[PDB]
């Protein structure tokens, strides 16, 4: 957003960008796309008709989406045939796609630590526990 400070240089860049989005009319082959993780700090002048428009909405993956995403990023790794990706999705909540790949990476790393070739379901569970830096301790008061 807008705010003589030293930001008056990137301001000219943004205004020149705005000028070019409004300079060219639709129906031509110059379709633009833009990506950002925080639209809260984005100048709404960028989000005006003739400029970008059509804000595509990217949500945190749901359970089935999380299971699917965790499936894609394990195709290149020798995952065991018996891994319940659905149960993995149940045990992975509030997890973005990057973490849904990091769980597979950490499961493979833990499998390497255990000295095994194929990744068991327990390796994936330990990856889920380790992707969020949690350490699993067998508490005595549960039994």
């Amino acid at each position: 957003k807008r705010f003589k400070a030293g930001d008056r240089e990137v301001q000219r860049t943004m205004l020149e960008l705005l000028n070019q989005l409004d300079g060219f009319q639709p129906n031509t082959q110059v379709k633009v796309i833009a990506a950002t993780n925080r639209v809260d700090i984005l100048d709404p002048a960028l989000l005006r008709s003739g400029r970008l428009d059509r804000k595509i909405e990217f949500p945190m993956p749901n359970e089935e989406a999380r299971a699917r995403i965790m499936q894609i990023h394990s195709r290149k790794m020798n995952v065991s045939p018996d891994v319940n990706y659905e149960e993995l999705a149940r045990c992975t909540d509030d997890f973005n796609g990057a973490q849904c790949k990091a769980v597979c990476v950490e499961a493979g790393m833990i499998a390497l630590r255990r000295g095994a070739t194929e990744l068991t379901h327990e390796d994936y569970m330990e990856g889920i526990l380790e992707v969020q830096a949690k350490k699993k301790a067998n508490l005595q008061y549960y039994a």
């Binding site: 807008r2 301001q11 000219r12 205004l15 705005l18 000028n19 709404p44 002048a45 005006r48 008709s49």
Partner: protein, 343 residues
């Protein structure tokens, strides 16, 4: 010879140009005497500078751009104000050439808004003949998405005046004083560029208690009411300040010279749905007959934007198909998906 003649005259103009030298662009900031000025270069120091004899003294007012000689340091000629899309405010946005017929079913509300805002800006002679200061400000309240912003753009297009649109919820910033500062900059901006339609979004954030953050909303409210009605210049700009909840609004914010005329814009009227579909679906190529009453009954509680999404999404269904809009089932499924998927 003739082509050589033309290019040789051009080359002689170039030869004369080679002798010509540049001037530093400067800006006059004061006029000490009738041969003294204080001119500041764009990026440079300030020089006490005189004016060329073949130059009018009056035209060089404080703020007049000039191009003085860079050796004698004397003004040689005036320059008009610099133009660039460097503006930090919404004035450069164009409301778009949209007529009052584009917004459908608000004929009464449209007429009241014209009477409130268009009259003082187009024909003030009526108001000065009666003897009343021209009214300024109209308050549009209704369900969200009903088309108040479109109405503001239609007025700003017919009046052919600069238009400022602002999200009032955005202006209240966590840091102290910036919330009122934004209103202050907005109003001083409207002073320079006149006439101005100051369309403010949902005011319930600004308009309508023991903490600093709550007294901040009080302070920005007082700044707003001072900007609209009060000291300095009573000005001619108009405001289309619109809200979503009218009871929250401060009673002082509803006064004749202080944003009167609570126009109610309810969800698109029963007959208004037909007109809205006519204006927003007519441009879409469709040879097939329409059962508009069926769509209107299937779209209850819809808002103005929903109909435009229905039209665009029906076009999308056509895109995923042959290309031509032929059947009502498309409007039905468009309405349903603009009903369930837009919830």
């Amino acid at each position: 010879l003739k082509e050589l003649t033309k290019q040789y005259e051009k080359s002689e103009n170039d030869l004369k140009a080679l002798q010509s030298v540049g001037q530093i662009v400067g800006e006059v900031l004061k006029q000490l005497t009738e041969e003294k000025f204080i001119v500041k270069a764009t990026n440079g120091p300030r020089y006490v500078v005189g004016c060329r004899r073949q130059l009018d003294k009056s035209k060089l007012k404080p703020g007049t751009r000039v191009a003085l000689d860079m050796t004698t340091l004397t003004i040689m000629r005036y320059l008009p104000r610099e133009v660039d899309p460097l503006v930090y405010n919404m004035s450069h946005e164009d409301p778009g050439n949209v007529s009052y017929s584009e917004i459908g079913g608000l004929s009464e509300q449209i007429r009241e808004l014209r009477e409130v805002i268009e009259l003082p800006l187009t024909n003030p002679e009526l108001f000065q003949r009666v003897g009343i200061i021209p009214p300024k400000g109209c308050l549009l309240y209704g369900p969200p998405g009903t088309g108040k912003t479109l109405l503001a753009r239609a007025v700003a297009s017919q009046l052919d005046c600069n238009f400022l649109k602002v999200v009032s919820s955005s202006i209240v910033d966590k840091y102290i004083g910036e919330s009122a500062r934004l209103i202050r900059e907005m109003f001083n901006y409207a002073r320079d560029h006149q006439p101005c339609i100051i369309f403010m979004d949902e005011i319930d954030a600004i308009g309508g208690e023991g903490t600093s953050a709550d007294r901040e909303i009080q302070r920005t409210l007082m700044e707003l009411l001072n900007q609209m009605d009060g000291f300095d210049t009573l000005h001619r700009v108009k405001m289309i300040m619109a809200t979503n909840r009218p009871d929250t609004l401060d009673p002082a914010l509803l006064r004749p010279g202080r944003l009167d005329r609570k126009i109610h814009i309810d969800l698109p009227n029963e007959q208004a749905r037909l007109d809205i579909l006519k204006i927003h679906a007519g441009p879409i190529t469709k040879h097939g007959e329409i059962d508009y009453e069926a769509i209107v009954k299937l779209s209850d509680g819809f808002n103005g934007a929903d109909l435009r999404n229905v039209c665009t999404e029906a076009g999308m269904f056509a895109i995923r198909a042959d290309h031509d809009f032929v059947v009502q089932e498309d409007f039905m499924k468009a309405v349903r998906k603009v009903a369930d998927s837009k919830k």
